Ligand binder design. Structure first.
Ligand SMILES: [Mg+2]
Length: 206
């Protein structure tokens, strides 16, 4: 599925459907542009940067990953060792590695996708999906849910992810996609979308 002009590398199935939804409401048409969202099924991006980098197919691509408080430092040294020659990156600290990696379109999200979405403006639509998909939730759990809608700081993050993972991370994102709007888009996701869009448009411009 790689007759692609570009590739967006994501960790799992939630981003594989959330990121295309956010691209539409940002008017970045990924399919029209020939851009694939490819889930790497975890946090190892190195085989895929090898594949798309200069010593592979040399195809424009971006990375979207979580900070994980961090593991992201080694995760990004690994891809930077590929895309940046035999340059040494060992002497940089995590922050230095994160800001270097942005030049190549690799963006780090602090915290994690679904909680961030629930705090930052999608709380009430997520509760709605959760209840359509888990219709016989105990009343103790429905109330904890409403406790977080009323106040996205009362959030039990582990339970939220427990429910979503029970629904299915891909399936839950597919059902929340109709709800995303431009102003609730996380910044790292907008940065990756713009970076891959720029690189494709810069090619057409010569
Ligand atoms: Mg992660």
């Amino acid at each position: 599925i790689f007759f692609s002009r570009g590739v967006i590398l994501v960790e799992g199935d939630a981003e594989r459907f959330i990121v295309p939804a956010f691209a539409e409401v940002l008017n970045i048409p990924l399919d029209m542009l020939g851009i694939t969202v490819c889930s790497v099924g975890g946090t190892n991006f190195t085989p895929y940067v090898k594949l798309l980098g200069p010593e592979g197919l040399n195809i424009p691509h971006v990375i979207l990953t979580d900070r994980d408080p961090p593991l992201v430092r080694r995760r990004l040294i690994n891809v930077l060792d590929v895309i940046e020659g035999g340059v040494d990156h060992e002497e940089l600290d995590a922050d230095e590695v994160i800001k270097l990696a942005e030049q190549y379109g690799y963006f780090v999200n602090e915290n994690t996708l679904e909680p961030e979405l629930f705090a930052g403006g999608l709380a009430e639509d997520m509760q709605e999906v959760i209840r359509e998909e888990l219709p016989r939730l105990r009343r103790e759990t429905l109330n904890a849910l409403q406790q977080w809608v009323d106040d996205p700081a009362q959030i039990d993050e582990d339970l939220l992810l427990r429910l979503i993972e029970r629904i299915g991370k891909g399936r839950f994102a597919q059902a929340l996609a109709p709800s995303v709007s431009e102003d609730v888009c996380p910044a790292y996701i907008r940065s990756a979308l713009e970076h891959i869009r720029d690189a494709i448009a810069l090619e057409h411009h010569h």
